[PDB]
Symmetry: C2
Subunit: 300 residues, 2 copies
C-alpha cells in the first residue's frame, strides 16, 4: 500500500514514514513498535531528537518478535551540527548506531548546513545549540564537502546505505553536486502550502535528488474545499498534494488512531486546477529558520 | 571616501560602471570619467569592452592625469572559466585587454560553472557552452575556483578577490574554506530587493558590499525624500546605499550627471527616511539565473 521511491543510491525508500521528532522518551519505544504493527516501515529520526535509543528499542522488539527483519525497516538519522568536522562525523554516527542498535542506517542526512563547534558526547548529548561555551554559539570552519567526503567514506565502510542533506537551499545543493562522488540521494526540507519553494523542488528532482517533506492549513478554505470535493480530510489532501508530485512525507500527526489513516491517503487524484489553487497559498512562510537562532544566513 | 577591504587595500566607495558601456565609446567615456574624478572602474570579461576600458585608462595615464596605482580596476571571472586550470587563462586575457599587470579586484561573477570554451573560439562566451544553444556545466566546486584565485593573488596578478551574486549559505560555506576571505560581495541591490539579512550577515562577517541595480526615480517615496532634500532621486538612491556602508556603481553617469553621481554625500538620510524606503522591499529580483536555464542560485 505504501509506494516506494528508488533513490539514486539504488536503494528503495518508503514514500511515507513515521516521524520520531518530538517523540517522548518514555513512550517512543511503544509508539515505534505499534507504528511497525500499523504497517509503518520508514522511521525518520535524528541525533538532535534525543530519543534514538528508544526508537531502537521499538525496532528491536518488532524484530525480536519476528514482525519484520532489519532489511524491511528503513532507518533515517541525521548528523547534528556539532559533528561536521570529519574526525567527529564517525563519532556521531557510532553514537546513532549504538542507540538504534543496528550495524548501519539506511539514510544519514547532514541535518543543517551549519557547523557548530564540536562537543564531546559525554559532555552533553544531544548538545542542541550548546557549543561548549555557556549559551554562546561557536562555529567551526568546516566546508560542507569536507563533511560529505567523510560520509562517503562511511558508506564505503558499510555503515550507511544512502546519504543526503536537510535544509539545503538551491545554490548550496548545486555546489555539493559538483564535488560529490556519491550524489546526495535525498533533500529533506520544510515543505507545506505556505512554503512551497516550487523552483527548489523542480531543480532537485531533475538532478535525481529525492525530496522528503517535513511539517492553520486545516481551516483554510482552499484546502477545506478541495477536501470536501473528494470527500477526504484536509490532512489527506495535504499528504496527497506532496505524494502525487513524487515527494516522500513524514506525517505531522500519527496519533495512535490516525496511524493507518496517515499512510493510506493515496486513494484520489488532485487536478491541475487543484494544484494551481493550492499554489496560491505559497507565501514563503518558513517556521524552521536558523536566522532566528543566531542570524545564521542559511535562507537569505 | 575609500573603504578599507579585509585585504588591507583601499577601494573607492563610488565607482564607474562598465556594464553595457558600448565598445565604440567605452575608451572615451572611461577617460572623461577619470577627468571627472572617478578612480574605480567596475568591469567584467562578460561585458566585452575590457580592451576599450584599457584604452581609456592608458590615455589618462599617458597624459599624466593619473598613475596606475591611483586607479582601481575591477574585473570578473566569467562562468566558463571556473575550472582551476582555466582561471589564470581568463585572468591573463583580462590583463592583456586592460593593458595592466594586475587587477585590483577580481570577482567570481556567478556561482555557476559553464563548460570551458577556448578564448579563440568565442570571447566573451556569454551563454555559449560549446554546444549550440545548450547549456553545459562542469563539476567545479566554488572552493576549487577560489583556491585558484588565491594562488593568483600570491602571484601578484590580483590585489583583492571577492564574489558576485552569492546567496547567504554559499558565502557562509565559502568563508569556512577560504584562506583569503572574500573581501567583496557584489549583489543586485535597490529599494525593491533590499535583502537586509544578507547585507547584515556579510557586513558583520567583514565582507564589503558593492551594489548594482543595472536591471524608482518616479516613486512617490523616493521623489518625496528627494524633493525633500532637493536632490535627484538618483542622488537619494546612491546616498541610501552609501550611508549604510555599501559601495555603489552609478548606473548611467550621463556626461551631464557624471560629476553629480560622485558627489551626493552632501546630506544625510534620517531614521524615518530609512523606514520609508524600507517599506518598498518586495523581493523583486531582475538578474536571476533561474531565467537562463533554471539555475537554482536564488531558490
Amino acid at each position: 500500500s505504501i509506494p516506494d521511491i528508488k533513490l539514486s543510491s539504488g536503494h528503495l525508500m518508503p514514500s511515507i514514514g513515521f516521524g520520531c521528532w518530538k517523540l517522548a522518551n518514555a513512550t517512543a519505544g511503544e509508539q515505534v513498535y505499534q507504528a511497525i504493527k500499523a504497517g509503518y516501515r520508514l522511521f525518520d529520526g535524528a541525533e538532535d531528537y534525543g530519543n534514538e535509543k528508544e526508537v531502537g528499542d521499538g525496532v528491536k522488539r518488532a524484530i525480536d518478535e519476528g514482525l519484520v527483519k532489519r532489511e524491511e525497516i528503513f532507518l533515517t538519522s541525521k548528523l547534528w551540527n556539532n559533528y561536521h568536522d570529519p574526525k567527529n562525523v564517525e563519532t556521531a554516527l557510532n553514537k546513532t548506531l549504538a542507540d538504534l542498535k543496528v550495524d548501519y542506517v539506511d539514510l544519514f542526512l547532514i541535518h543543517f548546513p551549519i557547523a557548530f563547534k564540536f562537543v564531546p558526547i559525554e559532555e552533553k548529548y544531544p548538545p542542541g545549540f550548546y557549543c561548549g561555551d555557556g549559551n554562546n554559539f561557536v562555529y567551526e570552519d568546516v566546508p560542507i564537502l569536507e563533511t560529505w567526503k567523510a560520509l562517503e567514506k562511511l558508506v564505503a565502510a558499510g555503515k550507511i546505505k544512502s546519504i543526503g542533506v536537510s535544509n539545503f537551499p538551491g545554490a548550496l545543493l548545486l555546489d555539493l553536486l559538483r564535488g560529490a562522488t556519491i550524489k546526495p540521494a535525498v533533500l529533506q526540507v520544510e515543505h507545506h502550502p505556505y512554503l512551497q519553494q516550487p523552483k527548489l523542488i523542480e531543480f532537485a528532482q531533475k538532478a535525481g535528488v529525492t525530496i522528503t517533506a517535513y511539517s492553520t492549513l486545516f481551516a483554510h478554505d482552499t484546502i477545506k474545499a478541495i477536501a470536501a470535493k473528494y470527500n477526504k480530510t484536509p490532512a489527506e489532501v495535504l499528504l496527497r498534494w506532496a505524494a502525487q508530485r513524487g515527494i516522500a512525507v513524514i506525517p505531522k500527526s500519527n496519533l495512535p488512531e490516525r496511524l493507518v489513516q496517515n499512510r493510506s491517503f493515496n486513494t484520489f487524484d488532485l487536478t491541475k486546477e487543484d494544484f494551481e489553487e493550492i499554489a496560491k497559498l505559497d507565501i514563503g512562510l518558513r517556521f524552521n529558520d536558523p536566522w532566528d537562532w543566531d542570524n545564521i544566513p542559511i535562507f537569505v
